[PDB]
């Protein structure tokens, strides 16, 4: 009988110059946070972020706020976010997020340099 709203998604910024040493062009951070700030660690045990197989160490796990992972790369792909709860009786929740790196044609003319892709969801208990 407990519902906890969350927001999840990513920010990304273009390097300016295509890094030749590896071909990466963007830095990005993927995250999960409560919709209204609160101690999410009180009920979340860990959040696992599973990255594309082109990453060494594709499994990243965060156990305290901020629940975020930062990387660089060149491509958009679907990140699998798995939220584990302190209660072992609570099955984990899985979210899918399409990493956004490339900016809309609206948002050059507006005057933003950071890409944001963010979504609302709700975690339900019993």
């Amino acid at each position: 009988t407990i519902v906890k709203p969350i927001v999840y998604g990513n920010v990304a910024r273009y390097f300016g110059k295509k890094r030749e040493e590896d071909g990466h062009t963007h830095q990005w951070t993927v995250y999960v946070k409560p919709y209204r700030n609160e101690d999410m660690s009180a009920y979340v045990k860990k959040i696992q972020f599973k990255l594309h197989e082109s990453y060494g160490n594709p499994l990243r796990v965060v156990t305290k706020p901020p629940y975020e992972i930062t990387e660089t790369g060149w491509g958009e792909f679907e990140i699998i976010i798995k939220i584990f709860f302190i209660d072992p009786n609570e099955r984990p929740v899985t979210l899918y997020h399409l990493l956004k790196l490339f900016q809309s044609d609206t948002n050059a003319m507006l005057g933003k340099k950071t890409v944001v892709s963010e979504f609302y969801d709700e975690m339900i208990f019993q």
Partner: peptide, 4 residues
């Protein structure tokens, strides 16, 4: 799985 991975683009551009």
């Amino acid at each position: 799985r991975k683009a551009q």
